Design a protein around this ligand. Structure first.
Ligand SMILES: CCC(CC)C(=O)Nc1ccccc1O
Length: 186
């Protein structure tokens, strides 16, 4: 099937725990895959205008590891629960993609998760101003804008609202699209 095909592709790129013990400042992100209307979508957040770091920006759910987390995947699941109400029975963590090195002392680890069809987002307004879906196929032919720095613009045809997606978030989206959608009969 569509969902079984996605997980089997993703598993070939799983690095597992290989880099997880290194002595960095540690953050995790969850890349949430949702099936709607016969196609795969990614779920994004818009960060609250009140936050210290990157207020108003598009990002995946995520945050800083804390002492309660059993491992890096637990960080990503805790944060997703707090930000959008995703419960653990509603997500299957399929793999761990290549981590992102920043600022010389920080390592951000991305996990891909398959989301239950009955999940409905409950944005926590102290952390998240908006939640939206983008079809995975968009990231193969994006609408690009140069700020020189590449910025994707996505307009939701439901309401005509435009979102800007950039940086690590945009890079990870393209990576997941390539993994899952390259070389497929139509
Ligand atoms: C903006 C939220 C995101 C959560 C994973 C974050 O805090 N990133 C980050 C961490 C350390 C240095 C720079 C950064 O952008």
């Amino acid at each position: 099937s569509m969902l079984d095909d996605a997980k089997a592709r993703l598993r070939k790129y799983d690095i597992g725990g290989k880099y997880s013990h290194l002595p960095y400042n540690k953050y995790s992100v969850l890349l949430p895959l949702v099936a709607k209307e016969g196609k795969l979508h990614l779920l994004f957040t818009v960060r609250s205008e009140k936050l210290r770091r990157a207020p108003g920006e598009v990002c995946f759910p995520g945050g800083k590891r804390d002492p309660t987390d059993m491992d890096d995947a637990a960080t990503a699941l805790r944060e997703a629960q707090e930000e959008v109400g995703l419960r653990p029975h509603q997500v299957e963590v399929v793999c761990c993609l290549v981590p992102c090195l920043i600022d010389t002392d920080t390592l951000i680890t991305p996990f891909v998760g398959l989301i239950d069809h009955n999940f409905q987002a409950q944005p926590n307004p102290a952390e998240v101003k908006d939640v939206f879906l983008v079809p995975l196929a968009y990231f193969l032919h994006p609408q690009v804008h140069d700020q020189i720095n590449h910025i994707f613009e996505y307009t939701n045809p439901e309401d005509g609202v435009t979102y800007q997606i950039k940086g690590m978030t945009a890079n990870l989206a393209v990576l997941v699209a390539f993994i899952i959608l390259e070389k497929k009969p139509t």
